[PDB]
Amino acid sequence: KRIAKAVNEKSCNC
Amino acid sequence: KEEHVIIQAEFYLNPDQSGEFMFDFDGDEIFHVDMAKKETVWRLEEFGRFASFEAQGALANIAVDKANLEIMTKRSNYTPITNVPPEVTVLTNSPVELREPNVLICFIDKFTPPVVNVTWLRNGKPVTTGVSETVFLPREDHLFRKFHYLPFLPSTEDVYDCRVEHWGLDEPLLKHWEF
Protein backbone atom coordinates (compact mmCIF):
# COMPACT_ATOMS: atom_id res chain seq x y z
CA LYS A 1 0.00 0.00 0.00
CA ARG A 2 1.11 3.64 -0.47
CA ILE A 3 2.58 5.65 2.39
CA ALA A 4 0.91 9.08 2.60
CA LYS A 5 3.05 12.22 2.65
CA ALA A 6 2.32 15.14 4.98
CA VAL A 7 2.48 18.49 3.21
CA ASN A 8 4.60 21.38 4.48
CA GLU A 9 2.90 24.72 4.96
CA LYS A 10 4.56 27.78 3.43
CA SER A 11 5.60 30.55 5.84
CA CYS A 12 4.35 34.07 5.40
CA ASN A 13 6.94 36.26 3.65
CA CYS A 14 6.64 38.59 6.61
CA LYS B 1 1.90 6.10 27.61
CA GLU B 2 2.17 5.94 23.82
CA GLU B 3 2.94 2.66 22.14
CA HIS B 4 4.51 3.99 18.91
CA VAL B 5 5.56 7.10 17.04
CA ILE B 6 5.96 7.58 13.27
CA ILE B 7 7.76 10.76 12.16
CA GLN B 8 8.25 12.20 8.69
CA ALA B 9 11.37 14.26 9.36
CA GLU B 10 12.89 16.68 6.88
CA PHE B 11 15.60 19.27 6.81
CA TYR B 12 17.15 21.84 4.51
CA LEU B 13 20.53 23.41 5.22
CA ASN B 14 22.13 26.59 3.84
CA PRO B 15 24.53 27.43 2.42
CA ASP B 16 25.19 23.71 1.66
CA GLN B 17 21.83 23.35 -0.16
CA SER B 18 21.58 19.91 1.41
CA GLY B 19 18.32 18.33 2.35
CA GLU B 20 16.81 15.15 3.69
CA PHE B 21 13.42 13.50 3.69
CA MET B 22 12.89 10.41 5.84
CA PHE B 23 10.41 8.43 7.92
CA ASP B 24 11.27 7.16 11.45
CA PHE B 25 9.39 4.51 13.50
CA ASP B 26 10.28 4.41 17.22
CA GLY B 27 13.73 5.81 16.40
CA ASP B 28 14.61 3.58 13.44
CA GLU B 29 14.58 4.69 9.81
CA ILE B 30 11.82 3.23 7.56
CA PHE B 31 13.13 4.91 4.40
CA HIS B 32 14.58 8.10 3.03
CA VAL B 33 14.36 9.64 -0.44
CA ASP B 34 17.55 9.94 -2.51
CA MET B 35 16.69 13.28 -4.05
CA ALA B 36 19.50 13.18 -6.65
CA LYS B 37 18.08 9.90 -8.06
CA LYS B 38 14.45 10.66 -7.04
CA GLU B 39 14.27 7.20 -5.46
CA THR B 40 12.70 5.78 -2.31
CA VAL B 41 15.47 3.98 -0.38
CA TRP B 42 14.13 1.44 2.14
CA ARG B 43 16.25 0.89 5.22
CA LEU B 44 15.76 -2.88 5.00
CA GLU B 45 14.96 -4.37 1.58
CA GLU B 46 12.03 -6.26 3.09
CA PHE B 47 10.12 -3.00 3.81
CA GLY B 48 9.50 -2.38 0.10
CA ARG B 49 7.79 -5.81 -0.30
CA PHE B 50 4.34 -4.32 0.20
CA ALA B 51 4.78 -0.59 0.97
CA SER B 52 5.52 2.17 -1.55
CA PHE B 53 6.27 5.88 -1.46
CA GLU B 54 6.18 8.36 -4.33
CA ALA B 55 9.70 9.81 -4.14
CA GLN B 56 8.82 12.87 -6.29
CA GLY B 57 6.60 14.11 -3.41
CA ALA B 58 9.71 14.58 -1.26
CA LEU B 59 11.19 17.07 -3.75
CA ALA B 60 8.08 19.25 -3.43
CA ASN B 61 8.43 19.19 0.35
CA ILE B 62 12.10 20.05 0.29
CA ALA B 63 11.34 23.04 -1.96
CA VAL B 64 8.93 24.32 0.69
CA ASP B 65 11.62 23.67 3.38
CA LYS B 66 14.06 25.79 1.35
CA ALA B 67 11.58 28.65 0.94
CA ASN B 68 10.75 28.48 4.64
CA LEU B 69 14.42 28.51 5.58
CA GLU B 70 14.94 31.66 3.57
CA ILE B 71 12.10 33.34 5.48
CA MET B 72 13.22 32.13 8.92
CA THR B 73 16.81 33.18 8.26
CA LYS B 74 15.55 36.73 7.58
CA ARG B 75 13.20 36.68 10.58
CA SER B 76 16.11 35.72 12.85
CA ASN B 77 18.41 38.50 11.51
CA TYR B 78 20.79 35.77 10.26
CA THR B 79 21.21 34.08 13.57
CA PRO B 80 23.30 31.04 12.62
CA ILE B 81 23.27 27.60 14.14
CA THR B 82 25.40 26.87 17.17
CA ASN B 83 27.63 23.86 16.46
CA VAL B 84 27.01 20.97 18.84
CA PRO B 85 29.79 18.38 18.58
CA PRO B 86 29.05 14.68 18.50
CA GLU B 87 29.49 11.98 21.09
CA VAL B 88 31.00 8.95 19.31
CA THR B 89 30.89 5.29 20.34
CA VAL B 90 32.37 2.26 18.57
CA LEU B 91 30.53 -1.01 19.08
CA THR B 92 30.61 -4.49 17.57
CA ASN B 93 27.46 -6.07 16.29
CA SER B 94 28.12 -9.33 18.19
CA PRO B 95 30.61 -10.71 20.75
CA VAL B 96 33.97 -10.84 18.99
CA GLU B 97 35.64 -14.16 18.20
CA LEU B 98 38.88 -14.49 16.20
CA ARG B 99 38.21 -15.32 12.51
CA GLU B 100 34.40 -15.04 12.93
CA PRO B 101 33.00 -12.28 10.63
CA ASN B 102 31.60 -9.32 12.56
CA VAL B 103 30.71 -5.68 12.02
CA LEU B 104 32.10 -2.53 13.60
CA ILE B 105 29.52 0.15 14.24
CA CYS B 106 30.46 3.81 14.65
CA PHE B 107 27.58 5.60 16.38
CA ILE B 108 27.75 9.39 16.02
CA ASP B 109 25.20 11.04 18.35
CA LYS B 110 23.85 14.34 19.67
CA PHE B 111 25.21 16.72 17.03
CA THR B 112 24.20 19.54 14.73
CA PRO B 113 24.33 20.83 12.02
CA PRO B 114 23.85 17.60 9.99
CA VAL B 115 27.24 17.76 8.23
CA VAL B 116 29.89 15.30 9.34
CA ASN B 117 32.84 13.43 7.90
CA VAL B 118 33.26 9.89 9.09
CA THR B 119 36.11 7.66 8.05
CA TRP B 120 36.88 4.13 9.06
CA LEU B 121 40.56 3.48 9.55
CA ARG B 122 42.34 0.12 9.53
CA ASN B 123 45.84 0.48 10.96
CA GLY B 124 45.53 4.27 10.32
CA LYS B 125 44.48 3.90 6.66
CA PRO B 126 41.05 4.91 5.30
CA VAL B 127 38.83 1.92 4.39
CA THR B 128 36.66 2.70 1.33
CA THR B 129 35.41 -0.80 0.38
CA GLY B 130 32.57 -2.66 2.16
CA VAL B 131 31.55 0.33 4.27
CA SER B 132 28.04 1.62 4.60
CA GLU B 133 26.27 4.42 6.42
CA THR B 134 22.90 5.79 7.30
CA VAL B 135 21.48 9.20 6.55
CA PHE B 136 21.08 11.70 9.45
CA LEU B 137 18.55 10.39 11.94
CA PRO B 138 16.44 12.85 13.97
CA ARG B 139 16.53 13.01 17.77
CA GLU B 140 13.76 14.20 20.10
CA ASP B 141 15.99 17.17 21.12
CA HIS B 142 16.28 18.10 17.42
CA LEU B 143 19.93 17.16 17.16
CA PHE B 144 21.01 14.26 14.90
CA ARG B 145 22.55 10.81 15.07
CA LYS B 146 24.17 8.62 12.39
CA PHE B 147 25.67 5.16 11.99
CA HIS B 148 28.60 3.95 9.92
CA TYR B 149 29.36 0.25 9.43
CA LEU B 150 32.44 -1.81 8.61
CA PRO B 151 32.22 -5.58 8.12
CA PHE B 152 35.48 -7.15 9.26
CA LEU B 153 37.26 -10.39 10.07
CA PRO B 154 38.63 -10.13 13.59
CA SER B 155 42.41 -10.59 13.97
CA THR B 156 45.08 -9.91 16.60
CA GLU B 157 47.04 -7.95 13.95
CA ASP B 158 44.56 -5.20 12.97
CA VAL B 159 43.36 -2.11 14.89
CA TYR B 160 40.47 0.09 13.95
CA ASP B 161 39.30 3.62 14.48
CA CYS B 162 36.29 5.65 13.59
CA ARG B 163 37.43 9.21 12.78
CA VAL B 164 34.81 11.89 13.02
CA GLU B 165 35.15 15.52 11.93
CA HIS B 166 32.57 18.14 12.78
CA TRP B 167 32.61 21.97 13.10
CA GLY B 168 31.88 21.65 16.84
CA LEU B 169 35.08 19.72 17.51
CA ASP B 170 38.50 21.24 18.12
CA GLU B 171 40.31 18.35 16.29
CA PRO B 172 39.32 15.10 14.54
CA LEU B 173 37.73 12.74 17.07
CA LEU B 174 39.12 9.12 17.02
CA LYS B 175 37.35 6.22 18.68
CA HIS B 176 39.34 3.01 18.85
CA TRP B 177 38.63 -0.68 18.69
CA GLU B 178 41.00 -3.64 18.83
CA PHE B 179 40.61 -7.29 19.79
Binding site: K1, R2, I3, A4, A6, E9, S11, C12, C14 | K1, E2, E3, H4, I6, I7, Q8, A9, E10, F11, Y12, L13, N14, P15, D16, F25, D26, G27, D28, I30, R43, R49, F50, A51, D65, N68, L69, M72, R75, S76, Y78, T79, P80, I81, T82, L91, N93, S94, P95, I105, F107, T112, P113, P114, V115, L137, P138, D141, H142, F147, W167
Partner: protein, 193 residues
Protein backbone atom coordinates in the same frame (compact mmCIF):
# COMPACT_ATOMS: atom_id res chain seq x y z
CA UNK C 1 34.67 26.27 4.89
CA UNK C 2 33.49 27.66 8.25
CA UNK C 3 30.72 29.89 6.85
CA UNK C 4 27.74 30.17 9.20
CA UNK C 5 25.00 27.56 8.71
CA UNK C 6 21.23 27.87 8.78
CA UNK C 7 18.96 24.85 9.31
CA UNK C 8 15.23 24.32 8.76
CA UNK C 9 13.54 21.17 10.05
CA UNK C 10 10.01 19.89 9.87
CA UNK C 11 8.64 16.90 11.79
CA UNK C 12 5.21 15.51 11.04
CA UNK C 13 4.59 13.24 13.98
CA UNK C 14 1.99 10.57 14.64
CA UNK C 15 1.71 9.28 18.21
CA UNK C 16 -0.33 6.11 18.74
CA UNK C 17 -1.90 4.91 22.00
CA UNK C 18 -3.55 1.43 22.47
CA UNK C 19 -3.20 0.34 18.83
CA UNK C 20 -4.80 3.22 16.99
CA UNK C 21 -7.51 3.90 19.59
CA UNK C 22 -6.03 7.34 20.31
CA UNK C 23 -3.82 9.23 17.92
CA UNK C 24 -2.10 12.58 18.28
CA UNK C 25 -0.74 14.37 15.18
CA UNK C 26 1.86 17.13 15.44
CA UNK C 27 2.98 19.35 12.56
CA UNK C 28 6.21 20.88 13.92
CA UNK C 29 8.54 23.45 12.31
CA UNK C 30 12.07 24.23 13.55
CA UNK C 31 14.80 26.81 12.97
CA UNK C 32 18.05 25.12 14.02
CA UNK C 33 16.76 23.18 17.13
CA UNK C 34 14.10 25.75 17.99
CA UNK C 35 10.51 24.74 17.39
CA UNK C 36 8.74 27.93 16.27
CA UNK C 37 5.24 26.86 15.27
CA UNK C 38 3.15 23.71 15.82
CA UNK C 39 -0.23 22.20 14.89
CA UNK C 40 -1.35 19.76 17.62
CA UNK C 41 -4.44 17.72 16.88
CA UNK C 42 -5.40 18.00 20.56
CA UNK C 43 -5.58 21.81 20.04
CA UNK C 44 -6.96 21.87 16.47
CA UNK C 45 -5.10 24.95 15.21
CA UNK C 46 -1.52 26.24 14.79
CA UNK C 47 0.13 27.97 17.74
CA UNK C 48 3.35 29.92 17.92
CA UNK C 49 5.90 28.11 20.06
CA UNK C 50 8.33 31.02 19.83
CA UNK C 51 7.96 34.56 18.50
CA UNK C 52 9.65 33.50 15.25
CA UNK C 53 6.45 31.55 14.49
CA UNK C 54 3.83 34.16 15.32
CA UNK C 55 3.38 35.32 11.69
CA UNK C 56 2.77 31.73 10.54
CA UNK C 57 0.25 30.60 13.16
CA UNK C 58 -2.05 33.55 12.33
CA UNK C 59 -1.60 33.18 8.56
CA UNK C 60 -2.19 29.41 8.44
CA UNK C 61 -5.13 29.49 10.91
CA UNK C 62 -6.88 32.00 8.62
CA UNK C 63 -6.95 29.36 5.84
CA UNK C 64 -10.03 27.21 6.59
CA UNK C 65 -9.21 24.47 4.06
CA UNK C 66 -5.66 24.28 5.44
CA UNK C 67 -6.93 23.69 9.00
CA UNK C 68 -9.50 21.15 7.80
CA UNK C 69 -6.72 19.15 6.16
CA UNK C 70 -4.59 19.17 9.35
CA UNK C 71 -7.55 18.21 11.51
CA UNK C 72 -8.20 15.14 9.31
CA UNK C 73 -4.51 14.06 9.43
CA UNK C 74 -5.05 11.71 12.39
CA UNK C 75 -6.93 9.52 9.88
CA UNK C 76 -5.69 10.45 6.39
CA UNK C 77 -2.04 10.35 7.44
CA UNK C 78 -1.46 8.75 10.85
CA UNK C 79 -3.92 5.83 10.93
CA UNK C 80 -3.40 5.34 7.19
CA UNK C 81 0.37 4.98 7.52
CA UNK C 82 0.13 2.85 10.65
CA UNK C 83 -1.97 0.44 8.61
CA UNK C 84 0.51 0.44 5.71
CA UNK C 85 3.50 -0.23 7.91
CA UNK C 86 2.01 -2.36 10.68
CA UNK C 87 3.21 -5.81 9.57
CA UNK C 88 6.92 -4.87 9.41
CA UNK C 89 7.13 -2.23 12.16
CA UNK C 90 4.56 -2.65 14.93
CA UNK C 91 4.57 -6.44 14.43
CA UNK C 92 8.32 -6.85 13.91
CA UNK C 93 9.68 -9.38 16.45
CA UNK C 94 13.26 -10.61 16.15
CA UNK C 95 14.50 -13.20 18.60
CA UNK C 96 17.64 -12.46 20.59
CA UNK C 97 20.95 -14.29 20.30
CA UNK C 98 22.20 -14.78 23.89
CA UNK C 99 25.84 -15.51 24.79
CA UNK C 100 27.19 -15.88 28.37
CA UNK C 101 30.92 -15.66 29.10
CA UNK C 102 33.32 -14.47 31.80
CA UNK C 103 34.86 -11.10 30.92
CA UNK C 104 38.30 -12.43 31.77
CA UNK C 105 39.80 -15.86 32.21
CA UNK C 106 40.11 -15.94 36.01
CA UNK C 107 40.51 -18.85 38.45
CA UNK C 108 37.54 -19.64 40.68
CA UNK C 109 37.27 -17.95 44.11
CA UNK C 110 38.40 -14.61 42.61
CA UNK C 111 36.40 -11.59 41.41
CA UNK C 112 35.08 -11.73 37.88
CA UNK C 113 32.43 -10.21 35.68
CA UNK C 114 30.04 -12.58 33.97
CA UNK C 115 28.67 -11.14 30.73
CA UNK C 116 25.20 -11.84 29.33
CA UNK C 117 25.34 -10.48 25.80
CA UNK C 118 21.87 -10.18 24.25
CA UNK C 119 22.14 -9.37 20.55
CA UNK C 120 20.05 -8.72 17.50
CA UNK C 121 16.61 -8.33 19.07
CA UNK C 122 13.57 -6.23 18.22
CA UNK C 123 11.64 -4.42 19.68
CA UNK C 124 13.64 -2.69 22.40
CA UNK C 125 11.53 -3.69 25.41
CA UNK C 126 13.44 -6.38 27.27
CA UNK C 127 14.22 -7.66 30.75
CA UNK C 128 17.48 -9.39 31.49
CA UNK C 129 17.97 -11.06 34.90
CA UNK C 130 20.87 -12.88 36.55
CA UNK C 131 20.56 -15.87 38.87
CA UNK C 132 23.14 -17.62 41.08
CA UNK C 133 22.07 -21.18 41.89
CA UNK C 134 18.40 -20.22 41.20
CA UNK C 135 18.50 -17.07 43.44
CA UNK C 136 18.07 -13.82 41.55
CA UNK C 137 21.00 -11.41 41.89
CA UNK C 138 20.11 -7.71 42.07
CA UNK C 139 23.26 -6.04 43.34
CA UNK C 140 26.47 -5.92 41.34
CA UNK C 141 24.57 -5.87 38.03
CA UNK C 142 25.79 -3.37 35.46
CA UNK C 143 24.60 -2.92 31.90
CA UNK C 144 25.31 -0.97 28.75
CA UNK C 145 21.65 -0.07 28.68
CA UNK C 146 19.70 -0.52 25.48
CA UNK C 147 21.85 -0.01 22.38
CA UNK C 148 20.28 0.69 18.97
CA UNK C 149 22.38 -0.78 16.14
CA UNK C 150 20.68 1.38 13.50
CA UNK C 151 19.49 -1.61 11.45
CA UNK C 152 16.25 -2.38 13.34
CA UNK C 153 18.01 -4.46 15.96
CA UNK C 154 19.17 -3.79 19.46
CA UNK C 155 21.77 -5.20 21.79
CA UNK C 156 22.53 -5.04 25.49
CA UNK C 157 25.30 -6.45 27.66
CA UNK C 158 24.33 -7.18 31.27
CA UNK C 159 27.25 -7.94 33.58
CA UNK C 160 27.27 -9.60 37.01
CA UNK C 161 30.09 -8.95 39.48
CA UNK C 162 30.69 -12.15 41.38
CA UNK C 163 33.21 -14.47 43.04
CA UNK C 164 32.35 -17.84 41.52
CA UNK C 165 32.96 -21.07 43.40
CA UNK C 166 33.16 -24.68 42.27
CA UNK C 167 29.75 -26.21 41.49
CA UNK C 168 27.84 -22.94 41.10
CA UNK C 169 25.51 -22.39 38.16
CA UNK C 170 24.77 -18.89 36.99
CA UNK C 171 21.84 -18.26 34.67
CA UNK C 172 20.97 -15.28 32.43
CA UNK C 173 17.22 -15.06 31.76
CA UNK C 174 15.71 -12.92 28.99
CA UNK C 175 12.04 -11.83 28.73
CA UNK C 176 11.12 -10.26 25.41
CA UNK C 177 8.04 -10.05 23.12
CA UNK C 178 9.57 -12.45 20.56
CA UNK C 179 9.61 -15.37 22.97
CA UNK C 180 7.11 -18.20 22.73
CA UNK C 181 8.80 -20.02 25.62
CA UNK C 182 11.42 -19.07 28.24
CA UNK C 183 14.99 -18.07 27.30
CA UNK C 184 17.78 -18.96 29.74
CA UNK C 185 21.50 -19.48 29.21
CA UNK C 186 23.69 -21.06 31.92
CA UNK C 187 27.32 -20.73 32.84
CA UNK C 188 28.70 -23.43 35.09
CA UNK C 189 31.61 -22.41 37.26
CA UNK C 190 32.99 -26.01 37.05
CA UNK C 191 33.18 -25.66 33.20
CA UNK C 192 35.81 -22.89 33.68
CA UNK C 193 37.87 -24.19 36.61
Amino acid sequence: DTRPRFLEQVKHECHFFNGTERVRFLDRYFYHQEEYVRFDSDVGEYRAVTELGRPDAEYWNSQKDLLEQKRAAVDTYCRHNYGVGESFTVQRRVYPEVTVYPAKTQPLQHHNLLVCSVNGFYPGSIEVRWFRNGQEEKTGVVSTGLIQNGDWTFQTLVMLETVPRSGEVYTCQVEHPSLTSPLTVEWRASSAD
